[PDB]
């Protein structure tokens, strides 16, 4: 029973820990986070849960998402001052839907998209991402190309891109900067696993492909 695949794959492993900075990034920033981070939901960024999910080909599951956000003071301020409250509008962007580019990026209203509301002074955000892919399971691999052009990337599904889990500061900027470490936890429930693969032996170098060295 403990060795059931539902019991096996439902471990809340950290797959994206983004310590994204909360400051007036509109003042002088070039490429970095503008009080928001756009993370495409792929379960392959951290190799523990990745090698847990390279065990199988096809993995249809209801992907429970748990977002634990901890606000720490910035090193520029170098003062504690107490932890201020900060509600976060955590949007999931589905495949095909547009992704935001700013903190006030006009997509955060989410007329079609689904966003949740929570605070930092509240236990972590537990919702359940629906199994949304066009195919009947999550092909974590793709022996093929996403597009019909030759330069399409190998290994990427045009259907298993889960979305973009975009988390911002809906509140305005503070004069005191704060590094918000957002930790993303995947609890895949309702595991429907198919066709087991060997566990990976050689270390990874690229998240997208399965190259070896």
């Amino acid at each position: 029973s403990e060795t059931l695949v539902e019991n096996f794959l439902s471990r809340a492993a950290l797959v994206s820990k983004r310590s994204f900075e909360y400051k007036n990034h509109t003042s002088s920033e070039a490429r970095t986070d503008k009080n928001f981070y756009k993370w495409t939901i792929n379960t392959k960024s951290f190799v523990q849960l990745r090698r847990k999910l390279e065990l199988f080909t096809y993995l249809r599951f209801d992907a429970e998402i748990t977002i634990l956000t901890t606000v720490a003071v910035g090193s520029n301020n170098s003062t504690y001052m107490g932890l201020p409250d900060l509600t976060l509008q955590a949007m999931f962007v589905p495949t095909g839907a547009l992704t935001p580019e700013k903190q006030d990026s006009f997509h955060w209203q989410s007329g079609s998209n689904a966003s949740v509301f929570f605070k930092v002074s509240d236990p972590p955000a537990r919702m359940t991402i629906p199994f949304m892919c066009i195919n009947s399971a999550y092909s974590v691999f793709y022996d093929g190309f996403a597009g019909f052009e030759k330069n399409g990337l190998y290994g990427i599904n045009p259907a298993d891109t889960i979305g973009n889990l975009c988390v911002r500061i809906v509140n305005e900027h503070q004069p005191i900067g704060f590094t918000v470490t957002v930790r993303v936890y995947m609890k895949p429930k309702h595991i429907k696993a198919w066709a087991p693969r060997p566990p990976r032996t050689l270390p990874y170098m690229s998240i997208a492909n399965a190259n070896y060295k």
């Binding site: 195919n135 022996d143 399409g152 198919w194 066709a195």
Partner: protein, 203 residues
Amino acid sequence: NYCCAYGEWPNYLPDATDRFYTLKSVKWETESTGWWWKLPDALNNIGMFGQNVQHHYLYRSGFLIHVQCNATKFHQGALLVVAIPEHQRGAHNTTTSPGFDDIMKGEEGGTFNHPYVLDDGTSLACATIFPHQWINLRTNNSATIVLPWMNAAPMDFPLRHNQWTLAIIPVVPLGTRTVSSMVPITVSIAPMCCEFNGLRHAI
């Protein structure tokens, strides 16, 4: 005896091209690393099924893999015939995704670069979890493998997706003390329970 994948017979989709498309048989040597044929890319350009690949935007097909190792009884060697479900390959020591010519090898199929890790970061030592038989020339001269529909999508494009991937690997190299002699790997694939919809232009 056949070794149908995970104990189920292939069939049509729930609510002509069954000719055994024998490939050009590869020379098995002592130094032969192994040969992989991605399906239907091994049959994308040959036969009426190969024309159905271009003529249809979507497809579904099972495959009756039959590998033949015609050998003397004095010959030595076992090949892992493994039909990998969805073999996403990798390249050694590079972070780059492998391109068209390293995967879309056509009817001839690709050789194995580092087959011990199965050229994908896994281990071939565990690759007997797969649809798999043995062509150990002591007892088995010809093996066969039955492959159902293996895709999360019910019915998809052939020309930009490989569902199965045959991989014939010499886990034990050839032995006849004339280094190697004859022994071809006659890989014959019959697309069984084939179905094609989406009548469009021949891509």
